[PDB]
Amino acid sequence: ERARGRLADELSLTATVLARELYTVGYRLTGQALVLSPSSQGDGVQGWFLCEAGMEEICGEVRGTGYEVNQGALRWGACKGEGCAPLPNNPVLGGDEVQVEAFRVAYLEGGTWKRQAQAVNLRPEGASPKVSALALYLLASVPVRGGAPAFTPGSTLSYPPGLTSSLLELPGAPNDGRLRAEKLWIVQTPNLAR
Amino acid sequence: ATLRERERARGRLADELSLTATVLARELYTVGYRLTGQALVLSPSSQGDGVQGWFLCEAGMEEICGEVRGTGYEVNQGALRWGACKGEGCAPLPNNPVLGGDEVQVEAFRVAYLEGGTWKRQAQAVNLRPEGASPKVSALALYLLASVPVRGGAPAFTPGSTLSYPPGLTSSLLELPGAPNDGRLRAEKLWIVQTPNLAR
């Protein structure tokens, strides 16, 4: 519908915000650069980076950023200082008309897609582990007049070699009449593979 | 439309405006980065504005990126729209929708600039030399207005009514539009983006 076009646009905006932020994780940093906290009920992701003022808006010091889904909203938090805790509290998307029903994050390590509790540390030797990219998934729903037909999450996705719905623990969706849309997108993480 | 429906609709629209503002802010913050030559061009009118900007890519800073990039925005066909390009003084053609163009209609976009404590809004190019910028732009102010349909209609909205202004910036500088009592629900956002690369 009109509804699906609009919701897909929200997911795109959201992806662009998240991608630009996560591409910078590990920039010029030594120490803990990323923490992934997945669960079968959904995922959290936290990252840190060095500010050089002039190049990225948020910014000569370390910053933390985070995202997770709480009570139907994708939420975001920020902080300053080495290993600071961002506390994702501000909504990005959802929590009322739009309901964000799933957020998932996987990482690419030397050609293999993984999804597990994992910290990434940067050291003179290098990154541990070597993360080339992140995969991010969002599912969301809106009410629509007269209801919409059933949605099977993962159905509209195009997957990179090796990445699966099972790795992502993609949810079921109820036949509740809500119109659903989803997005899988990949963010390269060159600062974590260096 | 009930109060509840209007609240829901308004919350959702405001969140879209916020996402949009973050996308634009992060893009415009970089304008002039490590660049010599023409870094920003503002094209305002009483019916709305266009803004174009250029910057140096350092590979490692931005996904899209050692070369010059152009970015642009304006509103047309009920969308805020964006174009990009590569190369010194390339023309970005704002084609791709950022927000709107169907259910959501973006009705107005305005850009003003802060120069040495004075807000301005006029046809203006910003040129960088190594010594610094001509003129010295500290920040940009951006305004968006958009509308959605709501079941049974919403009451009429006055544009500018919700806004909170920084010192020295005024509605008359922004030439804010009127809005019809068409039954569509409206929301708006004014936000400010610092431009350190344009202020030396």
Author numbering:
A (entry chain B): 39 to 97, 102 to 236
B (entry chain A): 33 to 97, 102 to 236
Quote the authors verbatim:
Type IV pili (T4P)1 are long, surface-exposed filaments which extend from the surfaces of bacterial cells. T4P are composed of both major and minor pilin components, although major pilins comprise the majority of the pilin subunits within each fibre. We identified a cluster of type IV pilin-like genes within the T. thermophilus HB8 genome, using the program PilFind. Three of the remaining six, TTHA1218, TTHA1219 and TTHA1222, yielded crystals of truncated forms which enabled us to solve their structures (designated here as Tt121836-123, Tt121933-236 and Tt122238-123).
Tt121933-236 crystallized in two different crystal forms; the higher resolution form, at 1.85 Å resolution in spacegroup P21, has four molecules in the asymmetric unit, arranged as a dimer of dimers. The second crystal form, in spacegroup C2, has a dimer in the asymmetric unit; crucially, the interface between the A and B chain dimer is preserved in this crystal form, providing further evidence that this dimer is not a crystallization artifact. The monomer-monomer interface is dominated by the helix-helix interaction across the non-crystallographic 2-fold symmetry axis. Tt121933-236 forms a more complex fold topology than XcpW and the related T2SS pseudopilins, with two main differences. First, two additional β-strands, β8 and β9, are inserted into the variable β-sheet, which extend this structural feature into the same spatial location occupied by the short α2 helix in XcpW. Second, Tt121933-236 contains a long loop, from residue 184 in β10 to 221 in β11, which folds back over the external surface of the conserved sheet (marked in orange in Figs4c & d). This has the effect of covering the external face of the conserved sheet. The hydrophobic properties of this face of the conserved β-sheet have been remarked on previously for XcpW, with the suggestion that it could serve as the site for packing of another pseudopilin. Interestingly, addition of this loop in Tt121933-236 preserves this feature of a hydrophobic surface, as apparent from the calculated electrostatic surface (see far right of Fig.4d). Tt121933-236 is also stabilized by two disulphide bonds, between β2/β3, and β4/β5; both lie within the variable β-sheet. Our results show that TTHA1218 and TTHA1219 are closer in structure to T2SS pseudopilins than to other type IV pilins for which structures are currently available.
